[PDB]
Each structure stands twice: as C-alpha cells, then as structure tokens.
Amino acid sequence: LDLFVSPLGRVEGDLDVRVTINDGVVTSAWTEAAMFRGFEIILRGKDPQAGLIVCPRICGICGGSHLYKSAYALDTAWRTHMPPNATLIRNICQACETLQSIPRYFYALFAIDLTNKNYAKSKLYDEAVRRFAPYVGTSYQPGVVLSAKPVEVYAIFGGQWPXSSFMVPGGVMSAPTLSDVTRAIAILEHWNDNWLEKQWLGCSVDRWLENKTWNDVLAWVDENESQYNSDCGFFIRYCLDVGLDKYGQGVGNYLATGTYFEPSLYENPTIEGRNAALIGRSGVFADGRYFEFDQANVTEDVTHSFYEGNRPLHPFEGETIPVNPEDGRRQGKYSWAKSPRYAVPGLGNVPLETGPLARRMAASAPDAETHQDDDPLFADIYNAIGPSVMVRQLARMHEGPKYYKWVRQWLDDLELKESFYTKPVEYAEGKGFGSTEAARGALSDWIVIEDSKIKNYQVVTPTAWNIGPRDASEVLGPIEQALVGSPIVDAEDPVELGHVARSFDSCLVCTVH
Amino acid sequence: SPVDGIRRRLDDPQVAEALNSLLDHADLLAVLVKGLDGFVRRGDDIANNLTSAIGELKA
Amino acid sequence: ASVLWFQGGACSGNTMSFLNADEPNVVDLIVDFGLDLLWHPSLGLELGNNAQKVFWDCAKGERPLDIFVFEGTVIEAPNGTGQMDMFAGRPMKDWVTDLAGAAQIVVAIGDCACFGGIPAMEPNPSGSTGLQFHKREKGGFLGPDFRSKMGLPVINVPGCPAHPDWITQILVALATGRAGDITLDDLHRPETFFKTFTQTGCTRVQFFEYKQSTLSFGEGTRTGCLFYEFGCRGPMTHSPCNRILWNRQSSKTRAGMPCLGCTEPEFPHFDLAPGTVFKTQKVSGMIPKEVPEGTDHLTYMGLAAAARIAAPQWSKEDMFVV
Amino acid sequence: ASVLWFQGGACSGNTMSFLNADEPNVVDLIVDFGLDLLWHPSLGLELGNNAQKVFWDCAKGERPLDIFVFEGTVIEAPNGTGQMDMFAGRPMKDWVTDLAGAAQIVVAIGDCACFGGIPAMEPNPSGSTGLQFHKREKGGFLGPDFRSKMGLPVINVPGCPAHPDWITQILVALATGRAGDITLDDLHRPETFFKTFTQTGCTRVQFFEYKQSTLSFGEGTRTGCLFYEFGCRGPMTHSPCNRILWNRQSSKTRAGMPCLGCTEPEFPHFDLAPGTVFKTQKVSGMIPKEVPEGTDHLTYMGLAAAARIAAPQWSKEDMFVV
Ligand code: FCO
Ligand code: F3S
Ligand code: F3S
Ligand code: F3S
Ligand code: F3S
Ligand code: F3S
Ligand code: F3S
Ligand SMILES: [Mg+2]
Ligand code: 3NI
C-alpha cells in the first residue's frame, strides 16, 4: 500500500511522508520537505554579518541555535577573540533555547500523539489522554506554558526570543547586569522546580542524572510513586506498554557536532580547535564505533533533492540552485531537503542521525576531558535496547536535567565585571565554520566571506541530516530508515509515521531554509 | 527629448559662458564643500570644544 | 471563534513567539477565550487526510472560519505556481486564496506574511510576498482591495517575529467583543501597538536625547544609544517593543542590540547589503542618512549639536551597570 | 541565610510589593533560595512569646542573623523613647539597635526605613527616621558609621514601596554567591537598580526630548511627558521603574502618573506642600524650578527651546492610543 501523508504536521514546517506498507509495516519511506525559502541564496552578496539576522529566521524554535553557530562562523572566519563571559552567555542562551524546546516540543508536538486511538486498549491510555491531550492535557498545559521560561532567560541576555541577533563576532551585544543574572537564575530554578523536577521527573535533576544504565532508568521509574507517575516515568511506561520502544530505530549511526564551549578553551575560535573546546562533545557514532567529528567530512547530496547538482559538495563549496519540483520529480527528486552525508572511513558517505540521541552517544565516547560531557547512559541504552522512538525521546528529555545543570553553573560562572565583547576586525576575506547542537542536533554554517561580502553561505541543519532524502547511492536518510519497519495500524491515521518523524523533533523550516 | 533640451541650453552662448565661469571657480566650490565635509567630520570635536568653553563659563 | 493558522514561507518564529504568550498564555487563549484553534501546523493534532478535511471544510465554507492566521510568506515561485510551498496537496498560495476568501478576519502574523519579510529579500528565490503587501507596496498576494468577510483588510501583525501580545491581545479583543476597538494604521497594523516607536520606552532614549552613542557591543552597551553607531532603527520603527517588553523581560535595544526595524515593511532594511548590518549609514561620516521619523536632517542635526553641548555628565557614563 | 524582617513605622507596602515578587516569587525565594525567613510580622507563624523567643535569640546572638530587613521608620517619639512603636515588649527602635548590631547584613526596605519617608514628613509626630539616613542626611537612627557584621552599611532599597525585584534580586545575589557584585551608591542603594533614572525607559522620554507636555490627566496622558505640568521627578530620580516594570506591567510614568521621586531620600519632595502635588513648580511660569539631574537651567532651557522648534509632528499627538 502506497500511503502519502500530507501534511505530517507538528514538525515545524511542511512535511509530506510517502510510505510503502506491506503487511501493516512500512517497507520504504520518502520524506518530502515541501517548502523552500532559499536563505542561502539570499545571503549571497549580503553583509558578512547578515547571517546573524537571516539565519535565526531559518527557524523560530531553534533560531537562537542558528544565531549561535552563525556567530561562531563569523568568529572563526574573522579569527575573533571571545571573552569568557561572551562564551558563557552564548552557551546559556543556546542551552536555554534547547530547554524551551524540550518541553514545548514534547508536549505540543510529540506527546499529543500518545492520545491516539490506536492506544485506546492500553491500560495507561486514559492517563495518557488526561496528561497529553492537546491544549487540555494536565501535563500539556503546564509543560507548554512553562516552556516559555528558559527563553525568558534568553531574552534577558539577548533582548528577546525568538529573533535576537545579539551573538556577534567577538562576543555578545549585551552587557548583563547583576539583576539580569539573578533573574535568569531565578527563572531557571523556577522552571526546573516547576516543570523539570516536579512534572517531568518527579525527582531532582541530580537523581535523574544518577541513571547510568537502562536498568538504572527502569529502577528509577519503579523507585517511588513520584518518579513512577512523573511525565518521564509515565512516558517510559507508556512507551514500553504501547511499543514505542519497538520501532523508529533508524540508522543507528549518529552525528553530533557538539556545542557549549568551555570559555577558556575557545577564546579564539578556530575550526581546528573547536572539538577540544566543546563541553557537549562532538562525535560520530558509526558502525558501533566512535569517530571524531570533522566538518571536512560533511557533504550535501542533491540527487533526490530539488536542487541542481551532480556530486556531493562540501558546504564550503556548497550550492543551492533550486530546480522546479515538477522537473525534479521527473528526475526522481522528491524533497527540498538536501541529503547531508558524512564520510566515515570504511563506510563511505553515510547518513548520520542527528539530535539528542546523537549527542548522548557522543557523550558516551571515551577520553572526555574534564569540561566535557561524559555520560555512559545512552551507550548502555543503545547496547541494551537500541534506538527507537522511545530511546530517541528519552535522549531528548535526558538533556533537560543535564543542560539545566550546565546553565545554572554557567550563570554562576559569569564574571559580571569582565568583558562580554572584543571588537573584532571585520576582515574582507574569511572562511568560517560555526557549529552548535540545536535542540534537534548538529547545526552548522559554512561561510565564505569575500570582498567584505558573503561569497558563500551554506547551512546544514540537524533535520536536514535526519530527514534529508536518499543520496546518490539511494541510501535512505535517518528518518526515512527510521520510518521503515514502523507498524501502521491505521492508514487513515498513520500516527506511527508521526511518532517516528516527531521523535526526531523534525524541523522542516530548518531542514530546507 | 527633454535631455536633448538641456544639451540645447548648454549650447546657449550665455548659459555656456556662466557654466564656464562656474568651472573656472570649481576649485573654490570644491574647497568650500571639502571645508564643509571637514567641519561636519569634526563636528563632534567642535561640539566638545563648545562644551569645554561653556563648562568654563559655568565654573 | 474558529481559528485556522497556516504557515507559508515561515520559520514558525511567530508561532514560537505566540507560544511565549502570557496574559493570556497560549493554552488559556486557545481554551478559555472561546477561540477554537481548528488547526495549526505546529500544534494541530490532525495529519494527512484528516487535516486536509479540516482545511477543505474551511475553504469551501462547510464550516465557519472566523480567523485565518497566516504566518510566513505567500510563496509564488516557481513561475507563479507556488510549488516551492506545497501544503496538503496544493500550493500554499491556493490555500491562502481560498481561506482568506473564507475567513471573517485574516491576520498576517510576522513580516513574512504581512510584507514578504526576509524571504522576499532579493533575489527572492521563493517568489515570496505578503498577504496584502510586498514590502511597503500595498497589494501583496491578495491585492490591495482584498477584504475579509468582516470587511477588514488583512490585519498585519508585523515583527520578525511578532511579539506574542501583538496577536494575543488582538485575539482577546476579538474574543471579548472589542473588535471595534481595534484601529489599523496605513500598514494595517494595530495602532494599539504600532503608534509608538521601538524607541518609545527604550532605556537609551536619554542617551539619544543627548546624542550619546553606544560605541561598542558588550560592556559598551552599558551606556549610550545604538542609533549613531549601530544603525538602531528604533526612532524610525513603529512598535511597542519597549512598551510591552519581549518575553516580559527586555527588548533588543534595552539589551544593546539595535532595533532592525522589523515591524516596518521594508525589513530587512537595505536588504542587509554590505555595510548596513549593525551600522549607521552616515553622510560625511557624521550625519545619519536616516533621521528619526518626522524630523529633517537640518533640525535633527542642529538639535543634536545643541544636545551634545547640553549633555549632562551621567549621559556620558555607564548607566546599565552590574 | 536567616532573614528577620521587622516593621517599624511601616505601612507594610514594601512587604506587599515584595509578595508581588516574580522570578523569583516570594515563596520560591523563601524556600528554594536557602533564605530562612525566621519571622516577618505579616508572614511569620509565631506569635507572642514564641515570636519573642525568635527575636531575642537573634538579638543576643543565640542564633545567627544573616539578613535583618527593616521596613518602616525607626519611631523615636515620644521624647526619644520610641513608645509610639512598641513591638514585642520593647520600643521597636531598641529591637532595631539589637538586631542591626547582630545581623550580617542590614537591609532597609522602603523610604521609611531608608530615609524616614512619609512618616518623617513634618511635623513628624512619630519622631520617625531611617536606619542610616534622615532624608538625604546620612546617619539616621544607627549613625553614619554603622556597619553590619559583613562590613556593609545599611543596604537602602528605597521606594515607597520598593519594587519586589529591588529586594528579591539583592536577596538572590546574596543567596547565589554574588554579594560581591552588589555595589551601593552614596545613598547605599544598589547601583544595579539606582544608576538609571525613573525616566530611563519611560515611554514618554521622546516627548520629554521634544519638550511636549502632557496637558491633562486621563486621555491627556495618551501623549506628552509629565515633567512640565505634573511635576514628574523622573529625570531627577534614580530608579529602574521604567527598566524593571512594576507588577511586570507598567510604571507610574507610563500610566500617566508623575514620578514622585520616591526612591530619592527627600521623598515626599517638598513635603507635599500646597501647590507641589502633581504640579511642576516653575519660575516665571515657564522655567521649571528643578531641571533634570546633571543639567543647568540655561543649557536645559536652551536645548528645550531648540527641541520645541524642531519637534516632529508625532511628538505633538496621541501615541498611547486605544
Ligand atoms: N534544533 C533545531 Fe533547527 C533543526 N533541525 C536547527 O538547527
Ligand atoms: S519570525 Fe519567521 S515566519 Fe517570517 S516574520 Fe520572521 S522569518
Ligand atoms: S533610544 Fe533606543 S530605540 Fe534605538 S535609537 Fe537609541 S537605542
Ligand atoms: S527589530 Fe523588531 S522586535 Fe522590536 S526592537 Fe525593532 S521592532
Ligand atoms: S510603602 Fe509603606 S513602609 Fe514606608 S516606604 Fe512607603 S510608607
Ligand atoms: S519622560 Fe517619563 S519619567 Fe517623567 S519626566 Fe517625562 S514622564
Ligand atoms: S515615585 Fe517611585 S516607584 Fe518609581 S516611578 Fe517614581 S521612583
Ligand atoms: Mg543548507
Ligand atoms: Ni528549527
């Protein structure tokens, strides 16, 4: 059965999903990013800092991430100096945007599908409906409402959220005051207490972060009624009951570009020094092995994308030349998403899943420096039960406590008397690579400044990694392979396709830009 | 064409004479506009000079 | 009051800003104010054919459509087909045509929808335009003479993104019987928000008054106004950004970021051409090319010189201190 | 960090304002920030001898007293006995002596406690004074040389009442290890709040800049600045009232009420003498008696004339429109 689902909403943009279904199981899948704005085209010839204004507009929910990586692209291109306070503010704001994204996405975009009639036979279905029904769910309302708090912190430092451009080469535009920091701390603590710990965890962030194995997580669910009946405990139990742990596996290979620089280690941003300075470590996890991320290994294939091109291009030489979707479909192209691939030795240019799960796998890599995220939890989960909708979601949710703790510490780390900005030299020429981990994963800018203008500007977003179509080798993108194997109880409401696509927290406006 | 008419005016002996006299003193016009550009680009300094002058009469 | 919120060439920032709503928050707006959110691409439960059923019922008049909110640009490329924005089996522009023709009120939220915004920046690959404007030029996709069924033009809630209150308070006004209190300016923006300027309530207006410039970002923004060195469009931009603070916390200008004039239809101004980003274009290095709204360069510069002379000492020192 | 909050000649407005705290709210401040509120007359559970036991343990050093918050004036009448303020078996001033001598930090919240405030208005029947100030004159009840055990003078959080953030953010700073970030001005006010003026962020500064006066209350406040006709002390008053809005909504000046300069030690200014309430005292009917801080009548008036002549049209029209 060929099933074309249009729209598949709650993916922050325009997504259609075509699936071949045999015996109630998806056997092949095509993700079709359906809306194109062409910001890379627009940025060409613009002011070298135009990215700081344009790139946040790639996406409402993760524009702060775009800003972060665009700023760092300029910082590397212009060989700027980043005062530690500026690095801290950038980290805080990136993480706060992610902390907003986590509940906002979980309740508003993902968890309402848990109320699908396909689960009516579950013993937890009534509770799932009570908690996660759209707009009236007892977990939905506070989760969504409180999701605005972390971006209040963002606004304290950046003026507003979404759509500040306050991260600039050489630091940040803002000069936090004491009350700024104290209020940011108060907002963060209130959000942590009222949503993260009270509602999501039913325990302290510290208690959750003590979970180092999948068995630890199950014991945590059963440990007491607070954790058992928390949104996290209920979600885990619901997933195990309704089978969200049984599909959406995907590629099983992961890309994290990392983000959150240790301020002392990235005072002078360079492409080469980026990985060592990361707190949230970069890392590629492919074929069960850890690899260092290298942006040089990134190509974008447009074979099945609505763009002209005949070979994968490293984004420094990237091109965004749209083809008319009618013609492209005549050529087998089906998506405005490019197909980002990563050259892994012994594997070729493979698709890599990006996102919190990719980050957790990277955090499980050996040889973490002291400043770096060293977390074996999702290595253990991956080895125990493997990837799935549930495990992907749990990675996303696991970042909540971890990032909250990091943000709280960074707010403590701010040295308010110290500089927030080192005026850079706006060089007429430069090649910049800025990367971050937006909520949904590796977000990267490759910028080429020439003649004091943007010569090239290539954005590769995490959902482009995940949802990008088949490459020249017809290798399905991570979301496409995750869709393959998904059960389809009801083709009229193929909610499992939504579960898989949304478990990646897909953002289609980011996918295409 | 109207542009043809401006070229026609340029032919006029009297118009031409005046335009030639303007180009004879174009150096003076250039220097006065350069002087104005200078004055404008040092307007902040002249404002600081008037501030220090008034600030003396204040003390 | 049924609400159908569609996204064209959008980044969903207006939706995300909207989700930051407080007093009312978004959930209370959707539930407790009688605003039946039929669907929203970021929030609607329905997918696929169920969602399309909702859309088609709205478009054909099978069910009433009181408010059609459109976010993002109306994408017309390629070649006016709109296929760079395919939504629910149609070019999004066709949905826009049908639903704008069906709605009692049409609200364009965000510059993209109002005026074309960032996607309409040259070279405008998506053929983006606003609902009733292309930049300042009235008409956009729906034409200058488009009126919704309540007789209103497209209500333009500009911004990039719009502040949540700019839409939520309009929605509350509509829901509380105060639609008649809503007056629109020449850009169809609610005058309750867009008679003020961004500068109105800016923490740096005293520095502006005394022509004290912020000189640098970061700690340099502990003083000064951003107009002179950072291209702040505050005094040329209608908005309540400093009256109704963003995220209930701040505003770009308060934080030290120049207002980019995003509520204005030309946004991004000068199409972010080289030398125009976070810079004040000046004539002869000292006269701003653009002076505040309603002033002329002569008077503005004379008053500026006088103010520089009269400037008190505190206006020359840090004020947003730790 | 133990906190003992006492009220002398107070109206409890600072407590009520404090209870309006958001980010942190008062409950989260008291519970989740490690601030052990030992007692508060409006909130403490203990009464009678149990409360007195708490007070005496703090006064005699039996239990640590980290922050002594004092609200209200130190009442010394009659005849320096302080018996117009008898609290828990003693004149309140005696409690003040003991607890201020015991506390690590002493915080006077509100003008009454900081400077004497309204009760210290002539004829001052209660013999009211501030902790370390009587109006602008340093020394108040505790003497100019009083220092708490952490070496600080009385931290004056002025206002009538103080805005909740003016105290809560200080308390958060103390609780989060940022006490060293707190700098105090010459009136011992936190400079993080009191380097700005009330005017800083006022929605009417553009009208001020162009010398466009609000002419009347009510709808008359849809335009204009209140300085010229309503005695707005905004430009002479240090406060973040327009930076950090009251009740997260507004400020007097935004709302159309003149700033009464309540964060200033002279408040109420001119002791509310006849003709000084909601009026600008003027010389020769044109020149304000008091000009903005750091300005001089001649440069102010010259700049004011220049601003009037160059005024844009919008500055002469309603801007805070319905
Ligand atoms: N998070 C996020 Fe948006 C996506 N995909 C970017 O980057
Ligand atoms: S917020 Fe986004 S939808 Fe358009 S108005 Fe700005 S690019
Ligand atoms: S007063 Fe404010 S709005 Fe801009 S022009 Fe100056 S920073
Ligand atoms: S850029 Fe826009 S959000 Fe307000 S501060 Fe300026 S009008
Ligand atoms: S609020 Fe009340 S306690 Fe004193 S400072 Fe004002 S009269
Ligand atoms: S600018 Fe505002 S603070 Fe008072 S003096 Fe005018 S109303
Ligand atoms: S009276 Fe006081 S509360 Fe603020 S507006 Fe003036 S300083
Ligand atoms: Mg790209
Ligand atoms: Ni996104």
Numbering used by the authors:
A (entry chain A): 4 to 516
B (entry chain Q): 20 to 78
C (entry chain B), D (entry chain D): 2 to 323
Please share excerpts from the published article on this structure.
Here we determined the cryo-electron microscopy structure of the Mycobacterium smegmatis hydrogenase Huc and investigated its mechanism. Huc is a highly efficient oxygen-insensitive enzyme that couples oxidation of atmospheric H2 to the hydrogenation of the respiratory electron carrier menaquinone. Huc uses narrow hydrophobic gas channels to selectively bind atmospheric H2 at the expense of O2, and 3 [3Fe–4S] clusters modulate the properties of the enzyme so that atmospheric H2 oxidation is energetically feasible. The Huc catalytic subunits form an octameric 833 kDa complex around a membrane-associated stalk, which transports and reduces menaquinone 94 Å from the membrane.
To determine the structure of Huc, we performed cryo-electron microscopy (cryo-EM) imaging and single-particle reconstruction of the purified 833 kDa complex. Three-dimensional reconstruction of the Huc complex yielded maps at a 2.19 Å overall resolution, showing that each of the four lobes of Huc are composed of two Huc protomers, each consisting of a HucS and HucL subunit. The four Huc lobes are bound to a scaffold formed by four molecules of HucM, an elongated α-helical protein that intertwines to form a cage-like structure. Out of the 188 amino acids of HucM, only residues 20–79 could be modelled into the cryo-EM density maps, with diffuse density corresponding to the remaining C-terminal region of HucM forming the stalk-like protrusion. Analysis of the Huc EM maps reveals additional density near the distal [3Fe–4S] cluster of each Huc protomer, which could be unambiguously modelled as menaquinone. Consistent with this, mass spectrometry confirmed that β-dihydromenaquinone-9 associates with purified Huc with an occupancy of 96.2%. The interior surface of the internal cavity of Huc is lined by hydrophobic sidechains of HucS and HucM, which facilitate the binding of menaquinone and other hydrophobic molecules and has dimensions capable of accommodating menaquinone. Activity staining of cell lysates shows that although Huc is active in this mutant, the high molecular weight species was not present, suggesting that HucM is critical for the formation of the Huc oligomer.
